[PDB]
Amino acid sequence: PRSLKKGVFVDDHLLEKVLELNAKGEKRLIKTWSRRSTIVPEMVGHTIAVYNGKQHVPVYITENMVGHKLGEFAPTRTYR
Amino acid sequence: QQLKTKYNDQVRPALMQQFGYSSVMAVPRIEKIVVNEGLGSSKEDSKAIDKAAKELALITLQKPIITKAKKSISNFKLRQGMPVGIKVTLRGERMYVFLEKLINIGLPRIRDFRGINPNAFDGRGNYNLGIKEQLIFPEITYDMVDKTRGMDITIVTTAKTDEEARALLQSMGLPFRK
Amino acid sequence: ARIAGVEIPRNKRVDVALTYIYGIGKARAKEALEKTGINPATRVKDLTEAEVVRLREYVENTWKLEGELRAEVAANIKRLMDIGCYRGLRHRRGLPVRGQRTRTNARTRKGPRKTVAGKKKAPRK
Amino acid sequence: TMNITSKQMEITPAIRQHVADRLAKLEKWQTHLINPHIILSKEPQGFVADATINTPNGVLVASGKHEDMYTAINELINKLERQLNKLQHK
RNA sequence: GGGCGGUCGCCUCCCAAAAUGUAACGGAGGCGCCCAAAGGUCACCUCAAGACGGUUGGAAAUCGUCUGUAGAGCGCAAAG
RNA sequence: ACGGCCUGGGCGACACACGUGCUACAAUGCCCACUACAAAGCGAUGCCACCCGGCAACGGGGAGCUAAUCGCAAAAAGGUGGGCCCAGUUCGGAUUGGGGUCUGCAACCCGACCCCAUGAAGCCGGAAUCGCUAGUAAUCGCGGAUCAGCCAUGCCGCGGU
């Protein structure tokens, strides 16, 4: 359904940091503030954590979760 | 003969071809068959189920009597001679040529039907598996028809040991969990 | 037209009988007639098994659909419901999963139709 | 069935139960009214309570301005009751 | 003890004192039927109950199976 | 510091109460073919004829437009026949997965739009309640305004009748 033809938006103001975990070394838990970025095979299976607006959420890209715009996994709404 | 023979000389020697037995009749025979169904008197308080009784004999004619369970309920239902059942004895030679409409038909339909039974078996030659609510037959209108089976099939085969219980029952016919 | 699964469309012309099935639409109704060189203005019952064969083979040669797609009806979403899917999310929650609202204009999944106790003090307009 | 709002204070279960208890009591009056709404205000001289109800045979209105917040709400609904009385006439 | 209450016929025993073997303001279940058939004849079938996983089948009602001092049931207490 | 720069998030949630509006219960309609008709504006970094792909949503070469003199649009409804015969109906169309476009270094939240499947409430809806004294009400359609984009069933204007 959803689409963009090509060049799936990937927050790169952080990609440089997210890729540090795979540029010369490895490390877990990085901070984040977004819900637009997309994930690529190059960086999968890592301890991550992003925000909402006021809330933080657990992140960890796995095979069972096609790394897309991300935000479509933890919007913001909350009720009961 | 037909299948009975592809049973007397086909799926009969194979067993000895694998590993024999002290007898030329040692191999398992057509022990028990039956069919089993009858999901209790649903439609009407026992008076419209007849239009689901004869429906048991929806392939041949042999007037089933539905039997009864055991009277002790008086909760759900059940009395001194209620239905709740099935059974009926109809084996024979044509019963072989009956596998022709068994170990053949059905598979070509039954939803996502791919294979037949994932192991399970054991203990006896009566592996409990079968039917949902499908006939696979057109030999009548099938429009005027409007029931709903359920249940399965049992058919024992005097195959106590697993390597008999479900041994011959492999090279037995062809349609099966491959 | 008992040729696959519970498919028995009849008592009219064939052109109609085409789309007249849970899986046939436009590019499948008369479009198939062409591939089989048949006119829409034909009778269904009249088509003896002979004609039925063309359908029994060409037509029946469809992908995962209608009668067979009954093995992905939920699978089409099985991989986008549980998992932390939004649709869960709208999957985990089984709510509409395709750009729209949830308060209203999506009452298909979220809430059947049973009258909810309407709000009292919080602008209902 | 019963909506209470205010741009000065909040809605407490006591104020809800108070007005609500009076609604269930207004049986003789029970005939129409569809999704009523009550508003609460305040002035240096006291508190004010307004209410509006839509029915299949028209609309009713009531207001109060007693020094006591609770008295105003009670007075307002008093007018609701007094209004429905004239609806039946005699 | 007066006696309101409670008692006034038959049947199961506990306690009755291993043959018969009584009482009681000591105690518990009921009744004055049923049935043209649970009567007579000939025949076959062991009952609740668990497990094997399969139906409308979120236990349970369906069936195959071994077990079964047979624990069913045989018209309504009770003993035999 | 109830001063300040910023990334995100609620206002497209929830057991709900009705208003405001759109679109339908049809057979008057489903769709095939062709065609006679209205005002109005607007398109300067803006609009679209043609070319070809092409199911189209769509695209690229860029003519032309500051214009009764090119476009926005072969208005819609309608008209003649064709096939369809009352069932919850080729009605209505909320609706769900897989795919595509246009805006944005982006459309999870929260885009309308093209395709594949798809398809409920509903045979006029207890009461109650609204509009108008003529071209009316009513039915079918168009543009403009705003808006970078995008989801007008809202807003202002106009007409086939």
Method: X-ray
Do residues A79 and C98 lie in contact, with contact meaning Cβ atoms separated by under 8 Å?
Answer: no
Q: Which nucleotide is nearest to C89 (CA to C1')?
A: F108
CA D76 to CA D64: how far, in whole Å?
A: 5
Question: CA C9, C10, C13 angle in degrees (round to 5)?
Answer: 115
Q: C13 and C31 in one domain?
A: yes
3-state secondary structure chain B: CCCCHHHHHHCCHHHHHHHCCCCCCCCCCCCCCCCCCCCCCCCCCCCCHHHHCHHHHCCCCCCCCCCCCCCCCCCCCCCCCCCCCCCCCCCCCCCCCCCCCCCCCCCCCCCCCCCCCCCCCCCCCCCCCCCCCCCCCCCCCCCCCCCCCCCCCCCCCCCCCHHHHCCHHHHCCCCCCC
DSSP letters of D10-24?
---HHHHHHHHHHHH
One-letter identity of residue B34: V
Domain assignment of residue C98, given as a range: 72-118
Which residues fall within 8 angstroms of residue A25, CB to CB, at 6 or more apart? none
Q: Do C122 and D3 touch (CB under 8 A)?
A: yes
Instruction: Give bridge partners of residue D42 from the DSSP assignment.
Output: D47
Q: Do C8 and B143 touch (CB under 8 A)?
A: yes
Residue of C117, C118, C121 lying closest to D5 (CB–CB): C121
Report the domain count for chain C: 2
Which two structure tokens, joined as six digits, stand for A24? 């010369």
One-letter identity of residue C60: E
Dihedral (C-alpha) B73, B74, B80, B85: value to the nearest 10 degrees?
A: -50
Q: C57 and C5 in one domain?
A: yes
CA C115 to CA D54: how far, in whole Å?
A: 19
Question: CA B114, B147, C5 angle in degrees (round to 5)?
Answer: 35
The terminus-to-terminus CA distance of chain A in angstroms comes to 30
CA C120 to CA C77: how far, in whole Å?
A: 37
D88, D86, D70: which is closest to D21 by C-alpha?
D70
Touch between chain B and chain D: 3 or more Cβ pairs under 8 Å: no
Q: D30 to each of A80, C29, D87, how far by Cα in Å? A: 33, 58, 12
A43, A28, A39, A34: which is closest to A13 by C-alpha?
A34
CA D12 to CA A79: how far, in whole Å?
A: 20
Do residues B31 and B158 lie in contact, with contact meaning Cβ atoms separated by under 8 Å?
Answer: yes
Domain with residue C59: its CATH number is 1.10.8.50
Q: C109 to each of C46, C72, C101, C115, how far by Cα in Å? A: 43, 19, 12, 15
Q: Which domains does chain A have, with CATH numbers?
A: 1-80 (3.30.860.10)
| Angstrom distance, C105 CA to F140 C1' | 26
Which two structure tokens, joined as six digits, stand for A61? 């890209």
Which residues fall within 8 angstroms of residue C66, CB to CB, at 6 or more apart? C4, C5, C7, C21, C22, C23
Identify the DSSP state of C101: -
Q: C29 and C51 in one domain?
A: yes
Q: C82 and C47 in one domain?
A: no
Q: Do B142 and C2 touch (CB under 8 A)?
A: yes
CA C73 to CA C81: how far, in whole Å?
A: 13
Rg of chain D taking only CA atoms, in angstroms = 13
Break chain C down into helix, strand, coil percent, rounded to 5.
25, 5, 70
CB-neighbour burial class of residue B38 (10 A; exposed 0-12, middle 13-18, buried 19+): buried
Pairing of strands D46-55, D58-64: antiparallel
Q: C113 and C54 in one domain?
A: no
Helices (H) and strands (E) in chain C, counts: 4, 2
Q: How many CA atoms lie within 13 A of A19 on its CB side?
A: 12
Q: C30 to each of B23, C13, C35, C84, how far by Cα in Å? A: 65, 12, 9, 43
Domain with residue C77: its CATH number is 4.10.910.10
Pick out residues 8-67 of chain C having their CB under 7 A from any atom of nucleic acid strand F. 12-13, 15-16, 21-28, 65-66
Say if C96 falls within a structural domain: yes
CA B119 to CA B113: how far, in whole Å?
A: 16
Phi/psi at B88 (nearest 5 deg)? Answer: 80, 135
Query: CB neighbours (10 Å) of residue C80?
Result: 19
The sign of the dihedral angle between the CA atoms of C102, C106, C110, C113 is positive
Do residues B127 and B165 lie in contact, with contact meaning Cβ atoms separated by under 8 Å?
Answer: yes
Break chain A down into helix, strand, coil percent, rounded to 5.
10, 10, 80
Which two structure tokens, joined as six digits, stand for B125? 């030659």
Element (H, E) at D45: none
Q: C105 and C58 in one domain?
A: no
Q: C76 and C30 in one domain?
A: no
Q: Do D4 and C122 touch (CB under 8 A)?
A: no
Which two structure tokens, joined as six digits, stand for C27? 């590019």
Say if C88 falls within a structural domain: yes
Resolution of the entry in angstroms: 11.5
Question: CA B176, B177, B178 angle in degrees (round to 5)?
Answer: 100
Give the three-state DSSP class for C35.
Answer: helix
Which two structure tokens, joined as six digits, stand for B134? 């499908």
Chain A contact for C118, CB < 8 A?
Answer: no
CA B2 to CA C14: how far, in whole Å?
A: 42
Say if C125 falls within a structural domain: no
Q: Which nucleotide is nearest to B120 (CA to C1')?
A: E53
B107, B174, B94: which is closest to B136 by C-alpha?
B107
Q: C58 and C98 in one domain?
A: no
CB-neighbour burial class of residue B43 (10 A; exposed 0-12, middle 13-18, buried 19+): middle
Say if C25 falls within a structural domain: yes
